[PDB]
């Protein structure tokens, strides 16, 4: 698109998760990525409504990002966003109704 | 995405197309645009008997940890941001662990973070420090490659300083001799000369870690 | 397209910031005794000036205190460094007084936000090399507000009018000048 | 039983939670709408007029667009969301198609929005009912009603809220082709319908009037008092 | 009793009972005190590992966040560890963004905001800890407390944990505003000794201080010297 | 999914009127389901772990029954509790050690590994989907600047470092015996540490051991690699002790 | 009861018992008062964090500044009040960035009330147990005063009260409030009288009351918090006036 790094930066967690899952499946077996995915989903299913900012403490502990700072944490603060939609529309969009 | 999706942080790629058109348009109309600040002066480093000597001419010697220091060349903002981020990460690591950090950890962090952005962040670094294992010296390039060498040079007067080292470098030197060699090699490329000395005798690896001032 | 020219000079318990005028706004107030000047593309200047006030107002509401010039410099640097791969075309200049100590402060930044703190004067624009010699020649330490105003006006004029803001502890003086 | 979940059917085919959502509607203030020959009139009862209250912020009549207005009965906080969504959708449809929106189109949009919230156990329905009235592009007056379940109908005169039974019984016999001859007659009919269930005189009446090629107008208390006095004089005569 | 199991359920009188039970869990932990003096703050607590089979330099209850901030807890240790890590990360982020050490009040507000989230969603559990935070900013000391519900207060002197009402009563009559650091340490150790239930030694209590030089955890030798002094 | 169960002791995310977590407390009683006891003792320049071996059926292949594991080339482990849970936690520990090495460029320490495992275990007690594992872990290793290390973590997410610890059914008696011995003396050679551990187990269990009823694993400053003793060496130690 | 387990269930008569309980939770908090005058607006509250060992930091404990033209006061749960105030500040700054003009008070109140209402309709969430009072000035209607409920309802008042003894305070204000002929001094005197008769204390003291005032001077809005000297003077004046009125009988 506009820049070579735009698509790479947008999809980084997904690629990292895919690489870790592939390595784990090749080394140990099918059970470990299954358990990791189920834990991720379980801890991610609880959080604030989409029009308010969350913290993601348990998910960060599970992923291991609780002792690391990146450029996503110091640039363009998502908590102090300059635009936000209507609450009901955001909640309906998260549910797939739109 | 959509106006109904929550926002996310990080870099922004919104002005790319407009800038791409504008730069060519101004080029073919004959107007100038602001640029970025760059540094390209000579930096060197030598491994002596029980420490590391880092030198630069005029500060360009950054702080990473009480036992690790760095020098940079290229775009100033990139070097500043990378050094600050790595220093913060190493401080968090030391607080969690309770011991002074290792040079290999900093080298690995810098390698991975420079490789993630495919060389678009222009920062060439010279890294040195003293560990429980001993003194180590590295050299990192903007694309994400590293060399572990007993002496390195970067900048404009690289050839003269490298010649001085290849002519006059011997293993297991002294502090004064290493400092004199670094100063002579730096002066061979050209202001003043700035020297940083890291010594094993002034570091205690047995006491618990405390946050430095 | 011409861009612009912004200058700042430091005196004795007072600062001055100047910009050129022809016969869009380039100097915006960010506090009681704090000013910022921008030079470059007009759209980018307006966008940066409007986005800085959002963060400044939120910071002053949450913290409960007046901001310091160094913190404003850091905020500007962060805002400029985000969008590093496609940048705004602006070159900020900051001049002001300490809200609690009343000490002068001047600074300059580049396209992507690399700060430069200088003790005597800073120059921004596309004619920095032309005005650097004049600033070096006509600057002397410990200048009274009238002398500082005269020397900054001369520096602007020797390189189409100018506007000069003089910041004092208890007053602000604005003067529009023509050659 | 069979009433503790939104999506559970009774053994005889009833959804009891959606029926309970209408008991909230049956407890709101009375609203009356009458469709005239070339005019449309709305009227809402005013209840519990506090002394230190501002009446500007508690109005129950809203204007969705230049030719559509609406009145509601039920929960007050639920109506605001629907009103805002309809207001946005009107302009969106005006962007899509140049011609002004249709009363039936906006009623269908509101009905679909209300019906969307009776499909899952994770959300509760809207406890409101509305009277949508307006004019079409050709110039034919229209009147519609919406239910919390998502059904809508076309009417000639209707009432919602408490007292709807008596008001509808009055309207069924007092609504003829002679009482809608003029705007004054239609307004008098609406006031008479309201006065059946409203005590303390005509001080608890809010009226809205819309004509062809004009905007919504809210009658003044002096005009309401004048109409009430005329009605009383005619009744005494 | 029907409203005592759910976290997102209001009682008919308008009460949330699970937060009260989390506070009860807090009230059953080891005692800890904190006193704000004229030129410093002192934090004291009672150790859990009261045995000879314990390695001294393994786990500590008094931890530093920044060079000028430290904290102690009363409640569940596992819940305390993750909050400590999050606080450290937040302080580092603030320094990176603003190029200036974070004030104590901002850190307390952010930590309380993190704690509040776990009291409004289903399928989770509130934290069972209460924190005491000390700092030094702009040449004056600070002392804060944070509840499991996400509310914070500023104190001159306070106690929490097992038998804290009598500790607060003792502090009320034993506290002086224009008080130095050494006498503050003596008063804190005496308040801890009031309800120790045993014999104190320099190996079953922890003390930390904060002053102009920054936060620092005291060594066992200094603790023994203070205990001998009093 | 299913939904929480009403009661003060039937779900993991429900407090009691005294602020207790009975579901977490019930996971500490699953450690005694196996019926075995473990003992770990740290010496001057060595660390020893001793556990109990029980093979009731004569049709079992005794080579496949063990409770000592190798996490890294320099880290050993002993597990007490449910067998499948112990094996799963061993696999997770290996994965975490590999991640640490890849990310930081050097081998993980014992205390850092224990802290990571405890951090993972803490999450299971705050979410209404997972359940705690009924097992406890004990790790030994040699630090290049500190010496031998002994660490233990609990199902609740709590970990600590010791000079000598125990787990299983007779944990309290083992703790009292070790406390008396450590109070008497703490500076031991390699031969005295293993004898101390074996004597502790024998005295507490009131039994005379055969070389096929116990398992021994050691680390040493001279040889940092984790090693598992053989039947001949165990018999030699038992003969010397007797 | 079988119809009061969650916010997404209707009773057979059409009621929301969880929302009713959340509204009932407000009665445990302190008293907050607001009065509208001809040349200003008033806000008076009651201090609850009274203790010999408590410290005094910040400017106030129950009054917050939202932007250059508005201020609010909360009653209920402090942890939820903090989130609500932060969201209000964000909304005001967003509108200012969008339009280069300050946000109107009713628009801000409606924006917050939509968020408050959204938490009473989707399951798995607990509604906010907070009530708020808003004061401000705008170019469309001038001085204004609003109120909000945990259910998402708001309204405009000339004098109102939330918290403990709210019914008695409202009755007294209704009995002894004049419409159209009030000034700041008379409003302050009425507020002092109402607070004295409302708080269950034999003698009122200046260390358990906080008063804020909003006004316009030279095209600027001024928000200030009164000092203990002024509060003491007002209390002394009220006491001596009451003594005079009693004696002249």
From Swiss-Prot, chain B:
Transmembrane segments: none annotated. GO terms for molecular function: endopeptidase activity; threonine-type endopeptidase activity. This is Proteasome subunit beta type-7. Residues 1-40 form a propeptide. Belongs to the peptidase T1B family. It comes from Homo sapiens (Human). Expressed at a low level in colonic mucosa. Up-regulated in colorectal cancer tissues. It comes from the Eukaryota. It is found in: Cytoplasm; Nucleus. The active site is at residue 41. It catalyses: Cleavage of peptide bonds with very broad specificity. GO terms for biological process: proteasome-mediated ubiquitin-dependent protein catabolic process. Keywords: Cytoplasm, Host-virus interaction, Hydrolase, Nucleus, Protease, Proteasome, Threonine protease, Zymogen. Its main location: cytoplasm. One of its GO terms (cellular component) is secretory granule lumen. Its EC number is 3.4.25.1. The 26S proteasome consists of a 20S proteasome core and two 19S regulatory subunits. The 20S proteasome core is a barrel-shaped complex made of 28 subunits that are arranged in four stacked rings. The two outer rings are each formed by seven alpha subunits, and the two inner rings are formed by seven beta subunits. The proteolytic activity is exerted by three beta-subunits PSMB5, PSMB6 and PSMB7.
Curated annotation (Swiss-Prot), chain E:
The keyword Nucleus applies. The modification Phosphoserine is found at residues 4, 11, 13. It comes from the Eukaryota. The modification N6-acetyllysine is found at residues 67, 168. Its main location: cytoplasm. GO terms for biological process: proteasome-mediated ubiquitin-dependent protein catabolic process; response to virus. This is Proteasome subunit alpha type-2. It comes from Homo sapiens (Human). The lineage of its organism: Eukaryota, Metazoa, Chordata, Craniata, Vertebrata.
Curated annotation (Swiss-Prot), chain F:
The keyword Acetylation applies. CDD domains: proteasome_alpha_type_6. It is found in: Cytoplasm; Nucleus. Its main location: cytoplasm. Glycans are attached at residue 4. The modification N6-acetyllysine is found at residues 101, 103. One of its GO terms (cellular component) is sarcomere. One of its GO terms (molecular function) is NF-kappaB binding. The modification Phosphotyrosine is found at residue 158. It comes from the Eukaryota. It holds the Pfam family Proteasome. Keywords: Acetylation, Cytoplasm, Glycoprotein, Nucleus, Phosphoprotein, Proteasome. The modification Phosphoserine is found at residues 16, 62-63. GO terms for biological process: positive regulation of canonical NF-kappaB signal transduction; proteasome-mediated ubiquitin-dependent protein catabolic process; proteolysis involved in protein catabolic process; regulation of inflammatory response. Component of the 20S core proteasome complex involved in the proteolytic degradation of most intracellular proteins. This complex plays numerous essential roles within the cell by associating with different regulatory particles. Associated with two 19S regulatory particles, forms the 26S proteasome and thus participates in the ATP-dependent degradation of ubiquitinated proteins. Belongs to the peptidase T1A family. The 26S proteasome consists of a 20S proteasome core and two 19S regulatory subunits. The 20S proteasome core is a barrel-shaped complex made of 28 subunits that are arranged in four stacked rings. The two outer rings are each formed by seven alpha subunits, and the two inner rings are formed by seven beta subunits. The proteolytic activity is exerted by three beta-subunits PSMB5, PSMB6 and PSMB7. Interacts with ALKBH4.
Swiss-Prot record, chain G:
Its main location: cytoplasm. Keywords: Acetylation, Cytoplasm, Host-virus interaction, Nucleus, Phosphoprotein, Proteasome. It comes from the Eukaryota. One of its GO terms (biological process) is proteasome-mediated ubiquitin-dependent protein catabolic process. One of its GO terms (cellular component) is nucleoplasm. The modification N6-acetyllysine is found at residues 125, 174. Component of the 20S core proteasome complex involved in the proteolytic degradation of most intracellular proteins. This complex plays numerous essential roles within the cell by associating with different regulatory particles. Associated with two 19S regulatory particles, forms the 26S proteasome and thus participates in the ATP-dependent degradation of ubiquitinated proteins. NCBIfam families: PRK03996.1 (NF003075). The 26S proteasome consists of a 20S proteasome core and two 19S regulatory subunits. The 20S proteasome core is a barrel-shaped complex made of 28 subunits that are arranged in four stacked rings. The two outer rings are each formed by seven alpha subunits, and the two inner rings are formed by seven beta subunits. The proteolytic activity is exerted by three beta-subunits PSMB5, PSMB6 and PSMB7. This is Proteasome subunit alpha type-4. It comes from Homo sapiens (Human).
């Amino acid at each position: 698109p506009s820049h070579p790094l735009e698509l790479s930066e947008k999809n980084f967690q997904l690629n990292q998760d895919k690489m870790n899952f592939s390595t784990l499946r090749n080394i140990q077996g099918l059970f470990a990525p299954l358990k990791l995915q189920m834990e991720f989903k379980a801890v991610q299913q609880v959080q604030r409504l989409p029009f308010l900012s969350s913290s993601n403490l348990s998910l960060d502990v599970l992923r291991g990002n609780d002792e690391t700072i990146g450029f996503e944490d110091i640039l363009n603060d998502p908590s102090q966003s300059e635009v936000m939609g209507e609450p009901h529309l955001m909640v309906e969009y998260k549910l797939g109704l739109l | 995405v959509s106006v109904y999706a929550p926002p996310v942080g990080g870099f922004s790629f919104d002005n790319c197309r407009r800038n791409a058109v504008l730069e060519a348009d101004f080029a073919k109309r004959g107007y100038k645009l602001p640029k970025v600040r760059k540094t390209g002066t000579t930096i060197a480093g030598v491994v002596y008997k029980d420490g590391i000597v880092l030198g630069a001419d005029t500060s360009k010697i950054h702080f990473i940890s009480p036992n690790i220091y760095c020098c940079g060349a290229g775009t100033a903002a990139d070097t500043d941001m990378t050094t600050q981020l790595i220093s913060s990460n190493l401080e968090l690591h030391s607080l969690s662990t309770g011991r002074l950090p290792r040079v290999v950890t900093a080298n690995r962090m810098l390698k991975q973070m420079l490789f993630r952005y495919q060389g678009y962040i222009g920062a060439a670094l010279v890294l040195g420090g003293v560990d429980v294992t001993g003194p180590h010296l590295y050299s990192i390039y903007p694309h994400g490659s590293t060399d572990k060498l007993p002496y390195v040079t970067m900048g404009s007067g690289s050839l003269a300083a490298m010649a001085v080292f290849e002519d006059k470098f011997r293993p297991d030197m002294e502090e004064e001799e290493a400092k004199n060699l670094v100063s002579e090699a730096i002066a061979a490329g050209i202001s003043n000369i700035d020297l940083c000395v890291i010594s094993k005798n002034k570091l205690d690896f047995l006491r618990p870690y405390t946050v430095p001032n | 397209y011409n861009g612009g020219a912004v200058m700042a000079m430091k005196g004795k318990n007072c600062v001055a910031i100047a910009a050129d005028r022809r016969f869009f706004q380039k100097i915006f107030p960010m506090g009681d005794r704090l000013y910022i000047g921008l030079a470059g593309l007009a759209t980018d200047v307006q966008t940066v000036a409007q986005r800085l006030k959002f963060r400044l107002n939120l910071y002053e509401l949450k913290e409960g205190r007046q901001i310091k010039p160094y913190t404003l410099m850091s905020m500007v640097a962060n805002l400029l460094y985000e969008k590093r791969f496609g940048p705004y075309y602006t070159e900020p200049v900051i001049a002001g007084l300490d809200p609690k100590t009343f000490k002068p402060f001047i600074c300059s930044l580049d396209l992507i936000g690399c700060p430069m703190v200088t003790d005597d004067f800073v120059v921004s624009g596309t004619c920095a090399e032309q005005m650097y010699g004049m600033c070096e020649s006509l600057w002397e330490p410990n200048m009274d507000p009238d002398h500082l105003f005269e020397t900054i006006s001369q520096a602007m004029l020797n390189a189409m009018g100018v506007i000069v803001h003089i910041i004092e502890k208890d007053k602000i003086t604005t003067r529009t000048l023509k050659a | 039983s069979y009433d503790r979940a939104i999506t559970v059917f009774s053994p005889d085919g009833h959804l009891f939670q959606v029926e309970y959502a209408q008991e909230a509607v049956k407890k709101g203030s009375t609203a009356v709408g009458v469709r005239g020959r070339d005019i449309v009139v709305l009227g809402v009862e005013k209840k519990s007029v506090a002394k230190l209250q501002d009446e500007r912020t508690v109005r129950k009549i809203c204007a969705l667009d230049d030719n559509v207005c609406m009145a509601f009965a039920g929960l007050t906080a639920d109506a605001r969301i629907v009103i805002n969504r309809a207001r946005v959708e009107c302009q969106s449809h005006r962007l899509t198609v140049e011609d002004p929106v249709t009363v039936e189109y906006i009623t269908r949009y509101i009905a679909s929005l209300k019906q969307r919230y009776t499909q899952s156990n994770g959300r509760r329905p809207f406890g409101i009912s509305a009277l949508i009235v307006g004019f079409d592009f050709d110039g034919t007056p229209r009147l519609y009603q919406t239910d919390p379940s998502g059904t809508y109908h076309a009417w000639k005169a209707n009432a919602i809220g408490r007292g709807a039974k008596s008001v509808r019984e009055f309207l069924e016999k007092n609504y003829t082709d002679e009482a809608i001859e003029t705007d004054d007659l239609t307004i008098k009919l609406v006031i008479k319908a309201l006065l059946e269930v409203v005590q303390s005189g005509g001080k608890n009446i809010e009226l809205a009037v819309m004509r062809r090629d004009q905007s919504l107008k809210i009658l003044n208390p002096e005009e309401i008092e004048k109409y009430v006095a005329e009605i009383e004089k005619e009744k005494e005569e | 009793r029907g409203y005592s199991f759910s976290l997102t359920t209001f009682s008919p009188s308008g009460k949330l009972v699970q937060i009260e039970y989390a506070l009860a869990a807090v009230a059953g932990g080891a005692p800890s005190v904190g006193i704000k003096a004229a030129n410093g703050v002192v934090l004291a607590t009672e150790k859990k590992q009261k045995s000879i089979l314990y390695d001294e330099r393994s786990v500590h209850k008094v931890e530093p966040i920044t060079k000028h901030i430290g904290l102690v807890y009363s409640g569940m240790g596992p819940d305390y560890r993750v909050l400590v890590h999050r606080a450290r990360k937040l302080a580092q982020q603030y320094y990176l963004v603003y190029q200036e050490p974070i004030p104590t009040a901002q850190l307390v507000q952010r930590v309380a905001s993190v704690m509040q989230e776990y009291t409004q969603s289903g399928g989770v559990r509130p934290f069972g800890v209460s924190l005491l935070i000390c700092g030094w900013n702009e040449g004056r000391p600070y002392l804060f407390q944070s509840d499991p519900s996400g509310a914070y207060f500023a104190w001159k002197a306070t106690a929490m944990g097992k038998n804290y009402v009598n500790g607060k009563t003792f502090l009320e009559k034993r506290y002086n505003e224009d008080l130095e650091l050494e006498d503050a340490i003596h008063t804190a150790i005496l308040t801890l000794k009031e309800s120790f239930e045993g014999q104190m030694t320099e190996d079953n209590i922890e003390v930390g201080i904060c002053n102009e030089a920054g936060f620092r955890r005291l060594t066992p030798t200094e603790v023994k010297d203070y205990l001998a002094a009093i | 999914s299913r939904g929480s169960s009403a009661g003060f002791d039937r779900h993991i995310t429900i407090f009691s009127p005294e602020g207790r977590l009975y579901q977490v407390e019930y996971a500490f009683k699953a450690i005694n389901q196996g019926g075995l006891t473990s003992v770990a003792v740290r010496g001057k320049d060595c660390a020893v772990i001793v556990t109990q071996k029980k093979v009731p059926d004569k049709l079992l292949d005794s080579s496949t029954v063990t409770h000592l594991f190798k996490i890294t080339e320099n880290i050993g482990c002993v597990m007490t509790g449910m067998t499948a849970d112990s094996r799963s936690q061993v696999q997770r520990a290996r994965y975490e050690a590999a991640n640490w090495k890849y990310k930081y460029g050097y081998e993980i320490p014992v205390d850092m590994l224990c802290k990571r495992i405890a951090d993972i275990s803490q999450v299971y007690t705050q979410n209404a989907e997972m359940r705690p594992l009924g097992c406890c872990m004990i790790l030994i290793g040699i630090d290049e600047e500190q010496g031998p290390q002994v660490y233990k973590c609990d199902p609740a997410g709590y970990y600590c470092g010791f000079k000598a610890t125990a787990a299983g059914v007779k944990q309290t008696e083992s703790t009292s015996f070790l406390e008396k011995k450590v109070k008497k003396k703490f500076d031991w050679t390699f031969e005295q540490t293993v004898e101390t551990a074996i004597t502790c187990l024998s005295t507490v269990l009131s039994i005379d051991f055969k070389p096929s009823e116990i398992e021994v694993g050691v680390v040493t400053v001279e040889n940092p690699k984790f090693r598992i003793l053989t039947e001949a060496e165990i018999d030699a130690h038992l003969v010397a002790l007797a | 009861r079988r119809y009061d387990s969650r916010t997404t269930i209707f009773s057979p008569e059409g009621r929301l018992y969880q929302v009713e309980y959340a509204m009932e939770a407000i009665g445990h908090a302190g008293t907050c008062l607001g009065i509208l005058a001809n040349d200003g607006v008033l806000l008076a509250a009651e201090r609850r964090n009274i203790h010999k060992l408590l410290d005094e930091v910040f400017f106030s404990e129950k009054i917050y500044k939202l932007n250059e033209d508005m201020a609010c006061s909360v009653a209920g749960i402090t942890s939820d009040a903090n989130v609500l105030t932060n969201e209000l500040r964000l909304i005001a700054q967003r509108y200012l960035l969008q339009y280069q003009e300050p946000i109107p008070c009713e628009q801000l109140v409606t924006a917050l009330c939509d968020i408050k209402q959204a938490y009473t309709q989707f399951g798995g969430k607990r509604p906010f147990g907070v009530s708020l009072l808003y004061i401000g000035w705008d170019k469309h209607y001038g001085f204004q005063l609003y109120q909000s409920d945990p259910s998402g309802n708001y309204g405009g008042w000339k004098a109102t009260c939330i918290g403990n003894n709210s019914a008695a305070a409202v009755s007294m204000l209704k009995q002894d409030y004049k419409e159209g002929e009030m000034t700041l001094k008379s409003a302050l005197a009425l507020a002092i009288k109402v607070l004295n008769k409302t708080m269950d204390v034999s003698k009122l003291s200046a260390e358990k009351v906080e008063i804020a005032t909003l006004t316009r001077e030279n095209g600027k809005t001024v928000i200030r918090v009164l000092k203990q000297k002024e509060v003491e003077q007002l209390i002394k004046k009220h006491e001596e006036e009451e003594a005079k009125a009693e004696r002249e009988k």
